[model samples]
Target: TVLTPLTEKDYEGLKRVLRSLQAHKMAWPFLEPVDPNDAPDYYGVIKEPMDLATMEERVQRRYYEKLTEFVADMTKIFDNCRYYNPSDSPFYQCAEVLESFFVQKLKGFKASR
Candidate 1:
């Protein structure tokens, strides 16, 4: 996925969502590795050895917390904007794409954690 720069409002909105998710513990659904080799690349080199189970668990946990925060923050943005148009908002569009990817990945891995 390509990285897109976020606006000030976007950042604020994202932060808000993140915080809310953390508060409610409703972010566990999105925290699992969709690919067995989906590990972060550090520096300029890949790690010598990969621990699939351990990595998957760690990623899953991280993602759960992340999604919880994201949804919460985004919801705030949506609420604050009286004329919010997701189609016209790049941030919203990006979020939709990301959410879709996550859903697809989860399905690919048959994720339940």
Candidate 2:
């Protein structure tokens, strides 16, 4: 594989990072997958739904072979939010904040690797 695989330690570090993201104040809406009943239009607009909980599950299951795979999913969480909300809305703003936060976190993780 062109990409390096995540070691067990790397996976553990990823899990911790995910937990921090989930615990962030503005992370409330993204903790879980959007319920279709509550947000019918969300599912219609966001075909590829993503959230912190789902990423946790993926990490637990070792679904990410490479760090970039995890990064892509993390990015999707924000991209999906931007797709469904107006740029000035709270959700979109949350996405922007979290996206920057995650990028910095990812950079730190990579630097240590």
Candidate 3:
């Protein structure tokens, strides 16, 4: 068997998700990987004009089509995270009693909406 070190690889945030959700140029939120100094400063939401209303209201209009498309993109991420769920893999979450990070991200988005 091969032994992998702790730093061999890790979740550098959901880097692909927000960028993929930007398929039609609407603003999306995401976080970035931390630096070696542990300073990851890419946290914030992308505010826009129609953000005041509820998610359902925003999706009712044609202009918010892309924003609505966020579902497909996010679903893809969640699908991958589940099918290839690192936490379920061999020593996936680092084994120190961490959390299922990626899926929680989707849940947070769903909750906030």
Candidate 4:
């Protein structure tokens, strides 16, 4: 019933997963933090923005204490993409596909452990 930091192996595994996400075809938009100039209303609509780059940095800094925390940020990236873009937009579709891919990866990782 207490919070704990991730084990070294889990942290390394998460980093590997992050690399996969970055290499994904639909991961372009989420590789870096959203710039205010690029999307003027992004910050306004999304209270908390998450991106692959930021996630990687967080991992390096040991900001995530659990696997769930990493998963939450990954989910946030897709959720924010869908919320900010139209349903028919390419960004929304990218998010959808990437989200599915991420879910599969997580399951695979857990299954192997």
Question: What TM-score do all the candidates reach, one by one?
Answer: 0.26, 0.93, 0.23, 0.92
Score candidate 4 by lDDT: 0.88
**What local lDDT does model 2 show for residue 27?**
87
Flag the better candidate by lDDT, 1 or 2: 2
lDDT digits (tens) for residues 1-113 of candidate 2: 41798899988788878988888888888999998887777777888899898999899999999988998898899989998889899999999888888877777777766
Best-performing candidate as measured by TM-score:
2
Q: Which residue pairs of candidate 3 clash?
A: none
* CA RMSD of each candidate after superposition: 16.5, 1.6, 17.9, 2.0
Give Cα distance to truth, residue 27, candidate 2, Å.
1.0
Cα lDDT, all candidates: 0.36, 0.86, 0.30, 0.88
* Residue-by-residue lDDT tens digits, candidate 4, 1-113: 11346788877788888899999999999999998998898898999988999999999999988777888889999989998999999999999999999988888777655
Structural RMSD, model 3:
17.9
| By lDDT: ranked, best first | 4, 2, 1, 3
Look at candidate 4 and tell me the lDDT of residue 53.
93
Which of the two, 3 or 4, has more lDDT?
Answer: 4
